[PDB]
Design an enzyme around this catalytic site. Structure first.
Site, PDB file in Angstrom:
ATOM      1  N   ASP A  36       0.876  -1.167   0.000  1.00  0.00           N
ATOM      2  CA  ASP A  36       0.000   0.000   0.000  1.00  0.00           C
ATOM      3  C   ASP A  36       0.914   1.218   0.000  1.00  0.00           C
ATOM      4  O   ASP A  36       2.141   1.088   0.010  1.00  0.00           O
ATOM      5  CB  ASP A  36      -0.972  -0.012   1.187  1.00  0.00           C
ATOM      6  CG  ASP A  36      -2.334   0.567   0.830  1.00  0.00           C
ATOM      7  OD1 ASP A  36      -2.402   1.779   0.589  1.00  0.00           O
ATOM      8  OD2 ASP A  36      -3.327  -0.181   0.749  1.00  0.00           O
ATOM      9  N   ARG A  86     -10.908  -4.410  -4.446  1.00  0.00           N
ATOM     10  CA  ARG A  86     -11.608  -3.149  -4.218  1.00  0.00           C
ATOM     11  C   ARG A  86     -10.702  -1.945  -4.477  1.00  0.00           C
ATOM     12  O   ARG A  86     -10.748  -0.939  -3.761  1.00  0.00           O
ATOM     13  CB  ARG A  86     -12.209  -3.111  -2.803  1.00  0.00           C
ATOM     14  CG  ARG A  86     -13.375  -4.113  -2.632  1.00  0.00           C
ATOM     15  CD  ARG A  86     -14.066  -4.057  -1.245  1.00  0.00           C
ATOM     16  NE  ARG A  86     -14.094  -2.699  -0.713  1.00  0.00           N
ATOM     17  CZ  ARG A  86     -14.961  -1.755  -1.082  1.00  0.00           C
ATOM     18  NH1 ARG A  86     -15.904  -2.014  -1.992  1.00  0.00           N
ATOM     19  NH2 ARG A  86     -14.878  -0.542  -0.541  1.00  0.00           N
ATOM     20  N   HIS A 139     -12.108  -0.188  -8.966  1.00  0.00           N
ATOM     21  CA  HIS A 139     -13.361   0.535  -9.159  1.00  0.00           C
ATOM     22  C   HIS A 139     -13.233   2.026  -8.867  1.00  0.00           C
ATOM     23  O   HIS A 139     -14.181   2.776  -9.134  1.00  0.00           O
ATOM     24  CB  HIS A 139     -14.472  -0.089  -8.299  1.00  0.00           C
ATOM     25  CG  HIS A 139     -14.274   0.086  -6.820  1.00  0.00           C
ATOM     26  ND1 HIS A 139     -14.058  -0.976  -5.969  1.00  0.00           N
ATOM     27  CD2 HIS A 139     -14.273   1.195  -6.043  1.00  0.00           C
ATOM     28  CE1 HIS A 139     -13.934  -0.532  -4.729  1.00  0.00           C
ATOM     29  NE2 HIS A 139     -14.062   0.782  -4.746  1.00  0.00           N
TER      30      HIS A 139
HETATM   31  N1  LIG Z   1      -1.392   4.615  -5.822  1.00  0.00           N
HETATM   32  C1  LIG Z   1      -1.599   3.691  -4.885  1.00  0.00           C
HETATM   33  N2  LIG Z   1      -0.626   2.736  -4.612  1.00  0.00           N
HETATM   34  C2  LIG Z   1      -0.840   1.781  -3.632  1.00  0.00           C
HETATM   35  N3  LIG Z   1      -2.033   1.781  -2.915  1.00  0.00           N
HETATM   36  C3  LIG Z   1      -2.981   2.718  -3.186  1.00  0.00           C
HETATM   37  C4  LIG Z   1      -2.786   3.687  -4.166  1.00  0.00           C
HETATM   38  N4  LIG Z   1      -3.894   4.480  -4.196  1.00  0.00           N
HETATM   39  C5  LIG Z   1      -4.787   4.024  -3.272  1.00  0.00           C
HETATM   40  N5  LIG Z   1      -4.222   2.934  -2.646  1.00  0.00           N
HETATM   41  C6  LIG Z   1      -4.787   2.083  -1.588  1.00  0.00           C
HETATM   42  O1  LIG Z   1      -5.797   1.259  -2.131  1.00  0.00           O
HETATM   43  C7  LIG Z   1      -6.714   0.892  -1.112  1.00  0.00           C
HETATM   44  C8  LIG Z   1      -8.137   0.991  -1.664  1.00  0.00           C
HETATM   45  S1  LIG Z   1      -9.438   0.554  -0.478  1.00  0.00           S
HETATM   46  C9  LIG Z   1      -9.229  -1.249  -0.635  1.00  0.00           C
HETATM   47  C10 LIG Z   1      -8.480  -1.868   0.547  1.00  0.00           C
HETATM   48  C11 LIG Z   1      -8.463  -3.398   0.613  1.00  0.00           C
HETATM   49  N6  LIG Z   1      -7.943  -3.993  -0.628  1.00  0.00           N
HETATM   50  C12 LIG Z   1      -9.875  -3.893   0.935  1.00  0.00           C
HETATM   51  O2  LIG Z   1     -10.287  -4.975   0.512  1.00  0.00           O
HETATM   52  O3  LIG Z   1     -10.638  -3.215   1.619  1.00  0.00           O
HETATM   53  C13 LIG Z   1      -6.408   1.782   0.092  1.00  0.00           C
HETATM   54  O4  LIG Z   1      -5.771   0.996   1.087  1.00  0.00           O
HETATM   55  C14 LIG Z   1      -5.419   2.820  -0.421  1.00  0.00           C
HETATM   56  O5  LIG Z   1      -4.404   3.115   0.505  1.00  0.00           O
END
Ligand SMILES: Nc1ncnc2c1ncn2[C@@H]1O[C@H](CSCC[C@H](N)C(=O)O)[C@@H](O)[C@H]1O
Length: 382
Positions: free
Chosen positions: A248, A290, A293
């Site tokens: 992340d 997730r 989207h």
């Molecule tokens: N450019 C990027 N690189 C890595 N992570 C990112 C990102 N932009 C957003 N994110 C991360 O993507 C996630 C989206 S929310 C989804 C979180 C998890 N996969 C679940 O099932 O709930 C968040 O944790 C956010 O920190």
């Protein structure tokens, strides 16, 4: 039409996921447009009464069991008894609250959750505070920016409705930790959408784990706090969390470390940006749950491309997302438009297939949740 009427009628006979879906479709059929409009308007007034009575601690003032007078409620919260009564009456008429006699109010099963801070009442608050204004601003937004699908992290419908289109949604929020707090608590409600362990079989990954003692097993791309990895590995000794990688942004990874108990069993932790090249090569499973989207097709192609280039021939990529049917269900159609306020969308399997193919992958199969559309799309290199 007379069959669904009968279907529901036999359903209501026994009454004395679709137990109540047919009740929505039956209502749709019989209602004409003018009954539709009054129903819609009642929804807006109902949510407003809900929001205010939560805000004013009224639901808290009403005992979970038993009766309390409007006067006593108003004295407890220090508010005009006339205003308390008029808004309570909205909830009485819709059955959220229950009036006893001429002057007394009480909770129901449908209103008790609003009497405390919890994920349900958090969801109510953010819906009213963080999505409704964006929907109301949509007519003006599309006149201002062009009538096309909204994407990009700046100039969201949300930022536009707040009066600063140049801020990102996250910049908007980091200025008020109270809004932060409500949002985080609310997302806990569906923090456990249906999990991999169960919905997907990782037995074949254990065989890979033994055949190559050196290679990364599961890389959770954008996995937030790694709840999904923990769940997958929890009671599988052949699936060791220590061979897995939670990825992340560095800021959230730092929070993972700062909030983890010493000596706890953890995956590797890696701060990174999944819009740039994927640092972990040749893992068995890449999981992106997730995340897609939130983004346009074009950004999704770039994200998936980095994963495809990092993947080995026997690697799989699991996309955890809602897969819209054509036409979509009510709740996924609803979320589709909510995501538009923040620059995202839900997708059919055809739309995913277009994006996956453009990243040099192909869809090998789909495992769909029971009683819903949330799925894992299993992809491999083309
Ligand atoms: N450019 C990027 N690189 C890595 N992570 C990112 C990102 N932009 C957003 N994110 C991360 O993507 C996630 C989206 S929310 C989804 C979180 C998890 N996969 C679940 O099932 O709930 C968040 O944790 C956010 O920190």
């Amino acid at each position: 039409a007379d069959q669904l009427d009968s279907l529901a009628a036999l359903l209501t006979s026994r009454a004395q996921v679709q137990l109540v879906k047919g009740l929505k479709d039956a209502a749709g059929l019989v209602n004409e447009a003018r009954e539709d409009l009054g129903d819609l308007m009642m929804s807006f007034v109902q949510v407003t009464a809900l929001r205010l009575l939560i805000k004013w601690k009224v639901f808290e003032a009403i005992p979970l069991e038993g009766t309390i007078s409007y006067a006593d409620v108003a004295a407890r919260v220090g508010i005009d008894v006339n205003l308390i009564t008029r808004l309570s009456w909205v909830l009485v008429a819709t059955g959220v609250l229950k009036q006893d006699g001429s002057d007394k109010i009480q909770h129901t099963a449908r209103s008790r959750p609003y009497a405390s801070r919890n994920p349900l009442s958090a969801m109510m608050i953010i819906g009213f505070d963080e999505y409704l204004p964006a929907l109301l601003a949509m007519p003006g937004y599309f006149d201002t920016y062009g009538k096309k699908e909204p994407f990009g992290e700046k100039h969201t419908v949300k930022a536009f409705s707040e009066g600063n289109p140049e801020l990102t949604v996250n910049q908007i929020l980091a200025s008020s930790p109270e809004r932060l707090g409500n949002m985080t608590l609310a997302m806990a409600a569906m923090e456990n959408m249906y999990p991999l362990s169960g919905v997907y079989d990782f037995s074949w990954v254990a065989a890979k784990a033994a055949s190559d003692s050196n290679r990364p097993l599961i890389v959770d791309v954008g996995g937030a706090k790694g709840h999904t990895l923990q769940a997958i590995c929890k009671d599988t000794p052949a699936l060791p969390i220590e061979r897995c990688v939670l990825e992340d942004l560095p800021r959230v990874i730092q929070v993972v470390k700062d909030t983890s108990d010493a000596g706890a069993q953890a995956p590797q932790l890696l701060g990174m940006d999944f819009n740039q090249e994927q640092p972990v090569k040749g893992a068995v499973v890449y999981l992106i749950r997730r995340c897609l989207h939130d983004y346009s097709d074009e950004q999704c192609v770039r994200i998936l491309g980095h994963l495809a280039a990092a993947m080995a021939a026997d690697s799989v990529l699991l996309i955890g997302e809602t897969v819209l049917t054509n036409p979509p269900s009510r709740p996924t159609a609803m979320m589709d438009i909510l995501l538009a306020t923040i620059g995202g969308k839900e997708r059919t399997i055809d739309a995913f297939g277009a994006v996956v193919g453009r990243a040099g992958l192909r869809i090998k199969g789909v495992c769909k949740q029971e009683g819903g559309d949330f799925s894992y799309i299993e992809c491999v290199k083309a």
